[model samples]
Target: PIATPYPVKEWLQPKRYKAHLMGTTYVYDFPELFRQASSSQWKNFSADVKLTDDFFISNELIEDENGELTEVEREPGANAIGMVAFKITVKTPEYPRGRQFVVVANDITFKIGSFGPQEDEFFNKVTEYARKRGIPRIYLAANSGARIGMAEEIVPLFQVAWNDAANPDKGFQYLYLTSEGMETLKKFDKENSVLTERTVINGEERFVIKTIIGSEDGLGVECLRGSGLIAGATSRAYHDIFTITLVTCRSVGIGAYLVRLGQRAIQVEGQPIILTGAPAINKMLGREVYTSNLQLGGTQIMYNNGVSHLTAVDDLAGVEKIVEWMSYVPAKRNMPVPILETKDTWDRPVDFTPTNDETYDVRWMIEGRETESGFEYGLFDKGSFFETLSGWAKGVVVGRARLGGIPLGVIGVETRTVENLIPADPANPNSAETLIQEPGQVWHPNSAFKTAQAINDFNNGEQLPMMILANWRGFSGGQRDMFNEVLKYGSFIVDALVDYKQPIIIYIPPTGELRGGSWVVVDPTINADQMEMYADVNARAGVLEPQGMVGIKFRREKLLDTMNRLELLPIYGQISLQFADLHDRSSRMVAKGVISKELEWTEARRFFFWRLRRRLNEEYLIKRLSHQVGEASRLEKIARIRSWYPASVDHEDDRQVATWIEENYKTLDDKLKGLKLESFA
Candidate 1:
């Protein structure tokens, strides 16, 4: 065993401590212990041992006549090579049914950990053992790289000679730990057997080995190959396993790629987890780069970039989280079981809405109907149904919301009470009225970017459900939104819906028409699973507004001639033609299965709630019940209340407005003075 530079202090000090397990090194601290305790409580905890030698070797070295090895030696490679292995045990307070895992760690302490003839044989034998016993194998790894001295032995071990030279792909089957590994694992699980063509070892263990490879690329090991392994492992695990990596010491080259690929969730401490360390990244980019863990590990950035799922403060907690995550997945392949919860009625009803349309408050619907407390609303602007880019596209309202206890991106339109028509920026010096007149003068890209980002954020979170309450005449067609890539914004929304798996419920109240560019805005053809339409008793659904059609296609022509030519046709009459035309379009959409349902205005909310309840009940029964009650109370309140908008602004005589404001304002000031309320208070 390698000598420890520092001495072991009190093992029970509740602070930093060290231990020697057999010949393996161990470190423990208060935080680690706390994590262990917390993980145990959650029925998700695991500990694994990994042994490393002084030198690490890759799989590309050759041995000479005198048994001399030739390989790059940054710091003495391949001294720890052996049949070294580790035992990992997972145990929790609630789940006494623990599991054990064994992995082969090729340490270089003995002989640079190089993949020599004997070393390769040892790895094959150990891996064979794992496969024969059906034990999941994990590689807790850190290595300089592959050994070049053992090239002759390593190359032959990797390459397989085949009779058919034309088919180079048919050479000996070698596993690189990428998509191929995932496919193989999937196949193995499906067949309930191992591949007979590959080497297998039989023993009392009797287990099908699930392979997981991990390593900071050793000298000769191609870093990309290592990354392939990590990606393959993560893909196989999908939502079922908690995969991660720890940058204990130095992790560079392809080792970094492995870290990125294998782990959906990651935790880094002390050192930077970069594609290349800061020094390298800065050097390559030709600039000095600096970033903290929080900045680099930003949840928003990672979630949006499709990189890490979540970053932790340090490695130990990250490991604990991994264990906790695993508890949610089945222990073995092909299992249909989920962790059972004992709690009931997690969902309970709360009355949120008040019976006053004049007291319209969005919170009444949000707070009263939300299934759970501490629910986070992402992109608050998305929920603004009453006001949406008023100065520009006052006709359209787009926002995001969560419905039926599930997070859903929502867009709604408000026909009344829109405000805030100011210049795009103070520096522009353009007056609101002037900008409005020009239409293109107030164009801003930042706002559009923010909106697109919000949608992207929700989509990446894996809980994105979209609901659109659309009532739009069309885009402004003005130069402002157009210049700011309004087309791109529309595409972003469409793409978000396309990529999302959660349900989408579209409710189109009365007067829902898609004119010109607007047709694609609420296009139901994109996502069919969650798409639906709701119409009011007096609803008008059509491709173009009646006035717009008349002005654009019939205004300058002879009225009688056009009427006789178009109006007399089955598709041109006002009620018979216009309404029927819309009905036909809606029917075609329905027939194509793009629109799931067409509901009445009165039944719209009810159907929405019902569908929401059904979907959530499948995942969380408690939340569903609570949500139902809350929604019922809100609906009852809405029924009693006349409207959501506030009462009309009361106007008095010339001095009445001034007098009323003075009295109320003075009363408030006097009350505050009497109470002596300070800023802190």
Candidate 2:
């Protein structure tokens, strides 16, 4: 579904093979799958990293042909480890050395990728290793569930204590083991293996079995403990290292929890991520209403709920997405944002111009508009825009993009009504399901929540500077929306800004409008230290729209009094609209000191490139200065430098700051070297 054809390679071709729950799709053996997922030049972290729990059950206890109990060995390769970890250099564009990260993939061929104690412990250790080394952790999830085991050896030897042997259909109270069972239990150390009480049954000595224990480590609660260990490790791993999970197949129970704990997830089409399978949920609900797992937790469900941020056609495409996401972020946590050398000229004018009322796709404005002739024009670096959570909260567009090679988190307004389809309730067949229209440029509960979540996620995980294309007209206040808690989410947007560490640039785009509560929530004063506001020359921002303002402030009587001419009242009444609109103009905004500058759409590219670069440089300088002198003296020195330098103090320009550094200390380049930032320029 793309107009322009991209270059195709042999590796892009999918080998049709049966997937667990996804039917036939792209599939590969473990080694080849890892190779396809990583950069061409990649190596295994270890030759064959395997972990085993001796106490874990690996064989089935079943009756033989002679009706005697015997331990049955699993098929060859069934005992193979269910998890694998690798250190890989991913195929990131323009990255010379590529980006290295840890990949933990479930090997479903072995025992349906069930996580026993050994798999969970290995997963925890591998995740911790990635955290300690400061690298991204990519999880390829395809699991059944936690390993569950029971002692089948005792089942055959036990007898149900019937109320009457002649009329066994009546009822049974408990189970008892015969003398033969006691003899077999003694061979396996009955004291430790079985919990029983001595009893007389049918005039024969028997043991009323309380519980028959298995010698496995991951039996019931023990398996849950392993899951808890990995869950905690994954939660902490996300804070320190980038953690992403791609559900290549069904991820049930604890497997699903791990994906959510990672916070960023990609789901392959037809794959499902759910706590319980459809069959189990159906049985619990006493109905066969659900058809498949996909119906319960498919892309349609998970993506709309924001559990899965992106969806791919197959595993190869899913892995490709993993690499694509890593491109916009730093190689490790607390590291510098990745910057690529782009051929897209920074001085070129942005082609797409938004009008006040037009309902154009925002993607065309953020990502470039690609033509049939193979030409393109966009605001950010060409082909650098990658949207996340695309299926959820359509009113607010959130994604990662690059400007003049600098990576940034972007939030753009969707200037069109979004239709949300509320699914019908299975329990109430007569209940009407409807598609509700959420007007654009208004913060509904879901959209507001999405905006704050995007901001927080980008700050905590990607750590990129933010650029908000502000065009909202306030929040939805209808009873339906208010009950959904729009105000709480609107407040969260401001709360997120207060804790933001990176620079924030909130720009009202060309012909865009920011009015009422939207203006207040994104005002620079909320985070003056790291935030700034800008507007296009044709943009507008005010407490209310012109029509609304004129309705209250310029009534017919007030208009006549102001003009003092009854004959000209009709013309003067219309003039009040112009007056109100003028008050909301970008020029008036700049004059009121509500925004920093009024820019034209054509010149915004060059202006922001330098603006972001200058801010980043200033941040580095402040950090380096704090380390050199103490924290208390560093601010003093910074303030003193800005005070003494005439040009920098007036404009806060990096060039002027460089001149000051050259005059005061070593040359600017040498000073950068001293701070381990020699390559900044």
Candidate 3:
């Protein structure tokens, strides 16, 4: 059927981004998200790009003397040796040489699209390419994962030694396996074998087998010594260029980290991405876990869980949206600003209802008056605002758009009540889940995680400028939220903001409040030069929300019945004034120097543009003068750490024996010598 041609030929081709799986249909409409992007954005299409054939990347399977198909003498397994890397000549409007980048996706048709041992090793080269070129990388990623599937010869590895016969003729026994596979095998065996009673199947007992140790450990590692490197290098990809993931399908195991860890992602709706599937859990737990792949990790689940940034109808739409987002960011930090096409002028009135109620949309303040009917509409640029993890954390909205013509990250907090739906435990209603009327303005557990994630993602990529529309009441202090560690997530925001290298400006509209931890993470002290605040005359900050402050005062207040007229009147008046008036007004925030300036929502757009331009100017100069400022070494070290940490590991060593005894730390040592090298005084 695969070879058989259909009337619609393009439908079969992967280049078109259309497929069918599990009873559902898939279609990726072309020019889908890419129509708005310039030709530079389209330069890396697979049709026009080709990987450079380097010997270091050779993965063809071959036999040694004997004619049997063998991976025994190969770096990558024989079944796994399929061409996987795609190198594209990037043509960003800013770069003269055209940025060159690569995306190595496992072909679903090839060997169940699982990564081979050597295939993982080859990823090192692709990662190396990005390091050498210093260009943005887009991971169009899906994988069956590494060190998976079976070999026909069937050499089963055992952790412990044996004395009796399991199957001498059919099964070969090997002793003292190489240290690399030794640790990996032991770990695997320990996880699988927990009971002796279960092992005596069919009146037969199992024992370790003797086998050849030559090159067996050479091919595989302790589960893997390579994938962790891929993940870490991807982290450093942020320090180099803009990085993103277009998760198509079946992103599993370590592939999850590769697809999402500190990266922007556009997840495909209905496609499953999981660490482990239901069947595996069912097998491991010894029970029927009645669930489908979609039920476990469909795009909606991921979006709501805060694992996904955005969702698309299909791969085509995902690609189009990615390119559209790329239009606002540079290919690399040193690269020029992207072409911005803001429909609204800098001086455009903010023009929003200042009412602090759920009836009034926060989007009205940030973009303009938008409703649930057209919630997608925004003020950044017409057709420019793209929200990620929208369905999950509706309270804390995060997305990428242009403030003027340049790229900016948007984080807005909504002030509305939301119904908390409890799915997992329908009748097993817990306190937090029972009689729940959760509000939107505060961060729920998932929203808290999303808060951490959104900031971390914005920090990870091309250092795009950030705008936080502050209107949060505070982190939700519900029993459910406390159980989920809402404060931890609140701190996640702080941790991410502290690490942020780009400019971040916070705007407190007339309805905005910078109360509690929400304000703590966004403060200018996190990065005074890079982070600043703009609040309205009505925008305020306090240690606690109004309810919290009033509740404390009420708990200690004297009863009106016991109080005399003299004692009651002034004290009651004072209590009301302190709790009510102080908590309501935002003016205190300005007096305390917590805000950059007191400005109306109508005046924000103009100042936002000016600040954006100034930051862009400063960003450009910082990149150009990196070497002059002595910060070139910082860039240099980030590159080295990306490769050095994993390169330091002895992939061939057995953990039982000390690898460090005879190891060489030459690369790591040289890189560390300049630890204090500074880019700026």
Candidate 4:
């Protein structure tokens, strides 16, 4: 059983002498209750508590007609004049413990639960704590709004600076929460939606409706801005548990947005959670939309419509559900799998040969083969090839899948299939002659490009690894292909290859020819580290065909020596024989460092698995190293220069800024020198 240092009695009292709900405030006393409730259970879940005295104390102030400010002394029973924000750390139990979480609760009884200058300071500190310790912050929100009088002190701290003009390493820092903060949240969600919203933000303009409720209490626009902090912070949290709003009492104006911003939300039944309390919105709209009809109170409206993931019967249940959801997510971005002692590995068999000669199905290769020992064959689309725009371009196959339980984008060539060309429709006489040549004929290149873009988009979002199978002889080399700018199509493939940040592995089987436009299609040199290739015994590659070489090299000789059979026949035969050695030439290119790896056909799958794991591990290490190196470098420079400058140094205090620029230049010089060495090596 876990124990909390704070007294459970402190949390048992209900506001205004009402009997405390079993779950609401009492839910914070989970450590003591879990022991009694689950004595027979041996899951060994423990809790770690971090109690900190670092908190904000709010004070009221009033301004005279001359704009002079004075602190206000409120009488008893008036709202407590201090707004307290502090953090609570919770840890998972050991032995049989599965997961852990941290909860940061804001004391609502302080200053009518509004966010003032002190509250903002506390919020920033709490977030910094979570970021540094790699913990998820569970916010117990019960606030009225922001303290506007303290904006002067709070706004600067919230400002996120733009990328440093003198130093490329430094990018924009944003105000902890605002419209900008919400934008960052959107990006995080675009990648992973571990966060859940209890409610939804209609839009920025629509959110202003909360101001009306603020006017009645003197909270005003500042209160709305304060509310933005909760919403904004919730948006940025990597996990849904990061920010949670408990509608214990009145939740109006900005409070509504905060609830909506959390990825997962728990609303207590019968509590009114709205942008404006029922009266304000009703007055503004000139219609009688009851609070119940506003999609905030009932389970059917909020849960069924997908506004919130869960709806608690009461306050205490809501708190329990929030903690439970937090257990499933990682504390920080790019951390290891949240689950411990999981049965996932990478030790699958390598079977490269196709079962059917008529249909070259890479999907079978992905799904039929195991990725690891315990895990079954892992494929995202159930092994079905996701050919995009299948009707438009039919040559290329592309889609998304998982390799070894990690998401990956996949693109491959369908060597066994030929595109059926379609003739131009009679309704559109301007259609190309190639389409006119075979009207209604099905084609394949459209599918290929579509696949490339789809994979590209997926890589951008999840940063998933990519797998590309190369086996193209060339694009359809005809007037139709030329008219469609097949050269541009090949360039688009190059663009996707270069822009992708995830690791990519390319496998080349027998008869794999990288000639003409295909050279750029499988060029590994552009993205050297991220790209790799494997080839089989039958792989055939070259820059051009024998016929093309013969036509170019012997054109003048053949025309000049029409009767010289010896010269013409020998030259043509020599050029034609060169085609047989195309694969050897490609191998020589590999030796020249144009390609990274050349694995045997039998070991292709095994080698890929090893390489992928190695790359992923290396990426993790590099990110950590980069962060440490950057910080250390900056600190070292600052310490060395701070003594040389005076206290009022202004912009000159940016010594690390100067050092960063110099470092970048030195790196560029080193790269240039290395390029020269490689060019002559």
Candidate 5:
């Protein structure tokens, strides 16, 4: 064990502190919410497009006692604009001028934050603007789905057709329009607004209204059309620009779809996201089972199902989380990732380690410890790891952290054997199951699923580089695990890596081991162009365990024949054990081309800092060159780039070509300036 005077807990554990929730009150209004949310200045883009309360009175009219049709007065305090669009400048330490993005936040005070025609149109416009500008699109959702309204003018004039006037208990038939209502409709030029059958009742001609058409803009399916329009726009924005959503209140129907379509979401604590409210659902089920909307789509359900990427205690915290998440990604689409100014030194020895064979907290390895004496060391920068989906899959941990100053996604394994208690189905009483999960060193179905999900999300959503602490022994292959489709999920891991466009580094820690299927899945060959593997000097890996390999390979007769000494026969078992262990060493792995290099435990922090920096620099150069190389003349440009440098580089390998460009950047820039290629234009 490494030398230390104090116990591991005293040296490794951070200081203890209790926090009181200091609640701060904030108004959830349009530009005010954004004013508090944005770290920098913002301005409303649609300020010139003035909106008024015209939702319920676009073509509404009423009849006075004198029989003249008059326009209805607009309702006081009616909200016509439910959503607002703003161009917010977000300032991080890495970006001084601030990266600009679009924010569309719904005003919950406006018609209960429902999506009317005007709101949806504005949302689509904002999303389109973000897409066109190649920036990020953020949605702050607190909505009650689509706006629904009815014609108020017809309600007062509707006269019921009773079966029996003398018997009041007899229910009425279809409603009818009286002569006065018909005269008012005709005078307003809306005679076709109702289908009427001429009839005589008590010597007066009455128009029996078979159907009344409400021409209001916000009534019925018209609102849904606007919802569909915005939904389609949100989907397109996701493909073009970085999109995220923060559910600050109860989001229903189309709100849920928008949140899911954004791909990454921050859910406020106790808030719900549902297609329909629980009250309606319970009514449909003919029971009062579901008491609240939270029971249907709270954080416990959404976060567990992987729909909610993170959770926040309040709306302010949710906005802060969004800002933190954005730091790991590029400011905009097709741009280089942001880099922070790290205070923690990159060159530092790893102080904490697993001193024995007991299971240790893997978080201690990734995130360094700060003791009471103020000593600290970690694999990445101190206090930079932000975990996501932590409440879901407990075995495999996934988060974002800064290596030196460069942000990257990290995946580490938890070594404890977790026991999960699955809640019973709401409709079934006896469907509960307590699952005793295997240790984190082994990948089971849920863990494997989580690993694949994290990889895919980091690749497609954030587009950040990845570092995986490879330590699994192998995937579970028991009959029960097989029945649960562990193999199918395991294959997803391979698929994710194969399509990964950014750099990936797989490192086995000092006391960690990788064997069998685990090693095969993460081998560099799976994505040779983007991936590399390394191991700690004390780490071990092979196709099988030492005892298993020795049992199969070395018998008593074979050991005797190899030793060739009758006097040394007593130590044959010891010799076999040593031979088996030697083959699993890091040197053997490096010699066989299984790993790129063997890293010392204390030196790994400094070593990976430079390695990851170099990889990111190379990738950025490639992106810059690719942007200039037009598809029509791509080969010509590649030939031109190769001709400028005399180094022998595989033209197909962008990294090698990028390295050559990086070395001779000044000369290449001068050459390009002199040549003035059309592609550069």
Candidate 6:
């Protein structure tokens, strides 16, 4: 029989995969979807065809072993595209290519591509299947974000007892609740509330409420977000599949944050993404805003804000970026970065970046071919860079790339100033289509948060070797920075790095200086086992300014007076002044065991790849060979960089990183098995 007409608009004739729930009291239509339902196709697709009004529904045509056939039903919803997209049998450019995967794009024609409850169940199953079977799953989200009103429909279902409330004539309906469940109803509006009353119990004021004692008002925005049904599938994919979100159209509310949860995201130029809508923006401003959506979430606005990593001109361009990125990522979290080098040559004394006085594209420093995206990469090999959280924290650039055939997590400190469009409008300063331009780069709260995220992204999934370019002056010290709990986010960097499972190396080039809080957070002592640091001859480093240190502890005045009699040069004269200032320089840092070693650009580049091998194999070298020999090998190097400060390494393990390191250890072990004491001999 033809399915009862779906309650949503005509174009929203439910996608075949989840049609079973269309008319079953669980259907919903989003406000944006309602606004979008009768609208036309995405306008930017220069050559794409218009979407169809209805989709064909079908059963999973399967036959049993004995040739008896039974149609397999497909919708609780069974995940996007039914089951066809979740398979290892799919082929790629090379047989068994590690990057083989599937795509799940919602039908935009339906309810303006509003993603819903039943549909999400299907997505969860697909993500779990991807995790269990080790296949890559890419999600293309184009909607009003996740369905909010839809939650109300299902929220009422689990609330049966309360729905049966308020029949005072019945004496104790369930023995636990009041006679009619109505007692609970008397206190609340019952229509939409959780009622409560206070009474003195033995002279103490106390109140009563329960899951059973809920209000119609109890279920709200937070309730939906906190509710398992709303966040479950997306959260699972977050830690499992190499989750990536491509926002091609309007994605807001819970949907806006879901894209962020995945770590990697590409934003289409015209899409609006935010937790707050235009009405709120206008209320804050006191006026009507028609094109408020674009004004609030335009690409120029968000890309600089850092909510997205890359910006695509059109939906098709966004897909291409996601696909190209997948080639460098693992099919699943269990694996390491998929290295591809049958095509381009891997160069070492990596070419110098053409950045002069102006802040040019940093990708130019790396190797890769350029695209319409305005970023140049291939820093390690041709087409090797895959950036995550590109839009959110442009200051500390983070992404995945290969180095001399080795997959590595790359973090570059952006020296250029960033222009971010903020919510507070300049015109009225009250609201409506208003935005303020904020300058960025110094470690603000968001950048700090992004740093924490980037560290975990590498440590927990597709664990790749980590490389950080140290260049920031220091964490931001402004009122806004401190107010945002910059310290909490700043400490997260320290926590993630210490908990880090893979090897980490920091490179400080010319004019690269990590002073004060920055050095303290990323110091090698935090995880000396897997951490190594190097600096260029031109770099500068210090725990704090020498002048400050001297003031607090040096007793410079007394020392200068005494030096006139006892030792003398320590404090008295002009030479002493120059010595105090010069003592805190980069060379001094190395001499004092603060900076690891200073090298030129060429030497540092070659060692970057070589260092990856060292750390990966170091753990084994100490285990397999003579413990004394390995101890001495490590001790010899440690003696040169002994830190005066303590190393804080007590952090919970980043399991994904641990798993990856273990996996690579096996490969590293096989290659090192033939070594003997004679090599040193």
Clashes of each: 62, 0, 18, 38, 0, 24
lDDT of candidate model 1 versus the reference: 0.39
Task: Show model 3 residue runs off by greater than 4 Å.
Answer: 1-80, 90-100, 149-209, 212-223, 370-379, 425-436, 544-575, 578-588, 622-626, 629-681
Q: What TM-score would every model get versus the actual structure?
A: 0.38, 0.84, 0.69, 0.39, 0.78, 0.62
Give one digit per residue, the lDDT tens place, for model 6 in 587-675.
Answer: 77677786567777655545665556445544444444443345455565333212211244211222333334455656545544544
Worst 10 contiguous positions by lDDT, candidate 1? 14-23
lDDT of each: 0.39, 0.76, 0.58, 0.46, 0.75, 0.56
Worst 10 residues of 2 by lDDT: 51-60
Tens digits of lDDT, candidate 3, 228-342: 7777877777666677787776777767777766467778887777788778877876767536777667775777666777888877677767766666666655555565553
**Ten-residue region with minimum lDDT total, candidate 4:** 206-215
Ranking by lDDT: 2, 5, 3, 6, 4, 1
Candidate 2 clashes between residue pairs 3 or more apart in a chain or in different chains: none
Q: After superposition, how far is residue 20 of candidate 3 from its true place, in Å?
A: 6.1
Cα deviation at 441, candidate 1, in Å, is: 23
Give the residue spans of candidate 5 off by over 4 A: 1-79, 157-183, 189-213, 372-374, 431-438, 547-581, 627-666, 672-681
Predictions: Cα RMSD each: 22.1, 9.5, 14.2, 20.8, 12.3, 12.9
Off by over 4 Å in 2: 1-80, 199-205, 370-376, 565-571, 626-651, 654-681
Best by TM-score: 2
lDDT of 6: 0.56
Q: In candidate 1, which residue ranges exceed 4 Å CA deviation?
A: 1-218, 221-253, 268-271, 281-306, 314-334, 337-681
lDDT of 3 at 341: 51
Global local distance difference test of model 5: 0.75
